[PDB]
């Protein structure tokens, strides 16, 4: 007896080309968890909705999924659109796992059958954090940003977690974007003996101090976010972009494990590298998790918030609020030629 399953996202408009990764790691997953047998031998059943990524029409996608009885919501695409379908499906008690949605404040209004499948931008710190304090044990560290709302909030969670690592932070500072000369901050990381920058912020700024960096003869390691991580950064910086770590997005379709989901997806002429093709997946494996143990979208939130479950993106955990717990991110290594590989 089917169980249907509603996977909504932008299936035209400006987004489409985004929507297309979700749909074919619905579709991929589902095809998967049925020719295994089920859930019990009942076949999961997607019903597609495009909500064009635009907030009035994913309110009345929200309310038909209502009236057609589905209980499980594998969507929305865009925060924007994903927000307000979210109070219905709360009010409604259908369970609704986003494999995209990146927007902190999904989240934060208490909500308790809400749940992501994608990590937020805010988990960059945590990752580098550890990478430091794991891999690279620098000697003296020093923490800039370019005083916005990305790069400043990203140094501070970086100081955070290295504070509590007990490592040597010499000293945490901003300076302005749009600047373009910094021979104040390398004089100061030649005078204090600084050997690892961490810098949040993005390309342009990172262009400039990596030149200036190198042309004075400092061997200082530097970091950023994946804002930093830019072809025409390295176009900018050239050879002083070398061995820049960044972090970013793993590339799941090049876990080993994966290759019969990226094979059977090449065979249908498909893209198999989108992102959202496996945040996408994973959604699904965790509600065939659920589904497993209740088929009450409340005691599935409850199941998923307080177990571990393996996907295509590896062990996921969710924190109280809906939001994947201790997601990492990966850590790369730039090259001179816009490559990027993945560091030690």
């Given at each position: 007896e089917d169980i249907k399953v509603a996977v909504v996202g932008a299936m035209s408009g400006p987004v489409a080309q985004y929507g297309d990764q979700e749909f074919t790691g619905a579709e991929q997953a589902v095809a998967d968890i049925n020719a295994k047998g089920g859930i019990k031998g009942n076949k999961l059943q997607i019903v597609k909705y495009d909500d064009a990524c635009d907030p009035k029409q994913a309110v009345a996608v929200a309310n038909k999924v209502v009236n057609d009885?589905?209980?499980?919501?594998?969507?929305?695409?865009?925060?924007?659109?994903?927000?307000?379908?979210?109070?219905?499906?709360?009010?409604?008690?259908?369970?609704?796992?986003?494999?995209?949605?990146?927007?902190?404040?999904?989240?934060?209004?208490?909500?308790?059958?809400?749940?992501?499948?994608?990590?937020?931008?805010?988990?960059?710190?945590?990752?580098?954090?550890?990478?430091?304090?794991?891999?690279?044990?620098?000697?003296?560290?020093?923490?800039?940003?370019?005083?916005?709302?990305?790069?400043?909030?990203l140094a501070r969670a970086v100081q955070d977690g290295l504070k509590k690592g007990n490592a040597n932070v010499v000293f945490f500072d901003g300076i302005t974007a749009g600047e373009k000369d910094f021979s104040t901050l390398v004089a100061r990381l030649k005078k204090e003996n600084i050997d690892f920058v961490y810098y949040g912020g993005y390309h342009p700024e990172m262009g400039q101090i990596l030149r200036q960096a190198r042309a004075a003869g400092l061997k200082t390691q530097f970091m950023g976010p994946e804002g930093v991580a830019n072809v025409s950064l390295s176009n900018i910086a050239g050879e002083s972009a070398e061995g820049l770590l960044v972090t970013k997005p793993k590339n799941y379709d090049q876990v080993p494990a994966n290759k019969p989901i990226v094979d059977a997806i090449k065979a249908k002429k498909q893209d198999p590298s989108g992102a959202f093709v496996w945040t996408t997946y994973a959604a699904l494996q965790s509600l065939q998790a659920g589904l497993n143990q209740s088929d009450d979208p409340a005691e599935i939130a409850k199941y998923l918030k307080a177990n571990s479950v393996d996907t295509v993106m590896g062990p996921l955990t969710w924190d109280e609020k809906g939001d994947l717990k201790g997601f990492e991110f990966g850590v790369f290594d730039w090259h001179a030629n816009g490559t990027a590989t993945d560091a030690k």
């Open positions: 009885g589905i209980k499980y919501v594998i969507g929305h695409l865009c925060s924007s659109s994903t927000q307000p379908a979210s109070d219905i499906y709360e009010d409604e008690g259908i369970l609704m796992i986003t494999p995209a949605a990146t927007a902190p404040e999904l989240t934060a209004r208490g909500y308790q059958l809400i749940l992501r499948t994608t990590g937020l931008d805010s988990d960059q710190g945590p990752t580098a954090a550890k990478y430091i304090l794991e891999k690279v044990k620098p000697q003296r560290i020093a923490i800039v940003h370019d005083k916005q709302q990305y790069g400043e909030g």
